[PDB]
């Protein structure tokens, strides 16, 4: 790796730490969990909260801040769900096949999540994704990169400068490819695995989108969402 | 009173009971209270919740259901804050000059409320209103009427059939005037007092409106509100 490459790693890693609370102390302020879509209020707040973190992370990816305010929104609106599926993995436990966040109230089985309006059609591959990914036992360096790589994809509906964003993503893909080669022993086939994950996040992105429209369309359900969720997941161009 | 008159009283009273939980058990599901607008999340949920109750109450006021869907929204969007200031009084305590709702976490001094984005310009007369009203020691029959009278005012911006709504409100004002004459000893001057209150709710309505625009305009504050609050307090016609 070179200095410029490394600087990007230290940059992404610090951005992640600044936007990811390992104490999950902020969950106590979401509308309480309830075990008729009883888990929607809590999860809609968990997700709304997460989006705020993804935006905070994105603003620190080197170069992103220099994109057009419109490109920033375009990349964000379309890759937000994917970044949240990626960052959530840092709390997914293969043991109890759930997301453990500080305490028991903040531990969500495939059961809890069902009461949020989502079906197995999403929950099924979602967990599968979490397991396969959890198994790659990536480093924080690689973990944070994969997020920046996914967020800086030029193949998103809305992207104007789909050529510069093409550069950035590449400048990142290298740092990752390189690191995995130098700093990750036994990871001689990792890169290919990771990139394969960014492709699975596409089918998941799609699924959530349809399932989201279904719920979103019902006001007795959308009135449960947050102004930020509605806007980022809304289709207003 | 006549039978028709009484039937309206039993109708309003049952509607109130069905839309007002004396246990305040639903407050445990709002985003937790915090004592930088720390009380906004909790109060925005308290208010969003209240609006849902006012709509539920309104749908049961005899005749209201027969108004035009547009008239219903017009009356609701403009008199919602007033109905919430009226129904809140059922929990206002002259002792600790606060709103006691089941427990200590759900007890809001003039202090707590300040951290919700509102200034004394509103909080001052608001409490004054609560005291003066709390002192009239109205009956539940009169209390529920005053709410229906206020909600069915034809002098609201948006009202199309401002003549029929003129009838209904009158049909209610009588039942009240009559009851106070027959069923309320010592209340030979009450009616005038109550009606005077509906006039104070107008200056308060105005104040909250301006203060609401101020907050509403800031996305770092409006993203804290609920989809229902934004819509009912929003100025979209």
């Amino acid at each position: 790796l070179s200095d410029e490459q490394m600087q990007i790693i230290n940059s992404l890693v610090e951005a992640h730490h600044k936007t990811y609370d390992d104490s999950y102390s902020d969950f106590v302020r979401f509308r309480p969990p309830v075990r008729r879509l009883s888990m929607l209020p809590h999860l809609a707040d968990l997700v709304s909260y997460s989006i705020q973190k993804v935006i905070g992370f994105a603003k620190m990816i080197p170069g992103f801040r220099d994109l057009t305010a419109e490109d920033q929104i375009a990349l964000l609106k379309s890759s937000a769900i994917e970044i949240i599926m990626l960052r959530s993995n840092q709390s997914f436990s293969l043991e109890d096949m759930s997301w453990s966040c500080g305490g028991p109230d903040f531990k969500y089985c495939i059961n809890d999540v069902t009461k949020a309006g989502h079906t197995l059609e999403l929950l099924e591959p979602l967990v599968k994704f979490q397991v396969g990914l959890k198994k790659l036992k990536l480093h924080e360096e690689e973990h944070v990169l994969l997020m920046a790589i996914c967020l800086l994809s030029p193949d998103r509906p809305g992207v104007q400068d789909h050529v510069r964003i093409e550069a950035l993503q590449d400048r990142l893909c290298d740092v990752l490819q390189a690191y995995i080669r130098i700093q990750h022993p036994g990871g001689r086939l990792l890169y290919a695995k990771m990139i394969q994950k960014l492709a699975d996040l596409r089918s998941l992105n799609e699924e959530h989108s349809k399932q989201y429209r279904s719920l979103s369309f019902q006001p007795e359900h959308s009135m449960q969402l947050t102004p930020l969720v509605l806007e980022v997941f809304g289709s207003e161009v | 009173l006549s039978d028709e008159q009484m039937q309206i009283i039993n109708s309003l009273v049952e509607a109130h009971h069905k839309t007002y939980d004396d246990s305040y058990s639903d407050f445990v599901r709002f985003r937790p209270p915090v004592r930088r607008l720390s009380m906004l999340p909790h109060l925005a949920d308290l208010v969003s919740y209240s609006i849902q109750k006012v709509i539920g109450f309104a749908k049961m006021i005899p005749g209201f259901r027969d108004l035009t869907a547009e008239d219903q929204i017009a009356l609701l969007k403009s008199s919602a804050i007033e109905i919430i200031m009226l129904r809140s009084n059922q929990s206002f305590s002259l002792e600790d000059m606060s709103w006691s709702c089941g427990g200590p976490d759900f007890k809001y001094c003039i202090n707590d409320v300040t951290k919700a984005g509102h200034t004394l310009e509103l909080l001052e007369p608001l409490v004054k209103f609560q005291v003066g009203l709390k002192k009239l020691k109205l009956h539940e029959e009169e209390h529920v009427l005053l709410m229906a009278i206020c909600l069915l005012s034809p002098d609201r911006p948006g009202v199309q059939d401002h003549v029929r709504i003129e009838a209904l409100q009158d049909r209610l004002c009588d039942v009240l005037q009559a009851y106070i004459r027959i069923q309320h000893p010592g209340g030979r001057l009450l009616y005038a007092k109550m009606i005077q209150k509906l006039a104070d709710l107008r200056s308060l309505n105005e104040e909250h409106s301006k203060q609401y625009r101020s907050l509403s305009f800031q996305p770092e504050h409006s993203m804290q509100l609920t989809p229902l609050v934004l819509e009912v307090f929003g100025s979209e016609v």
Partner: peptide
């Protein structure tokens, strides 16, 4: 539109 995303992106 995107009122909230802007405020957060500055």
């Amino acid at each position: 539109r995107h009122k909230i995303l802007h405020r957060l992106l500055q």
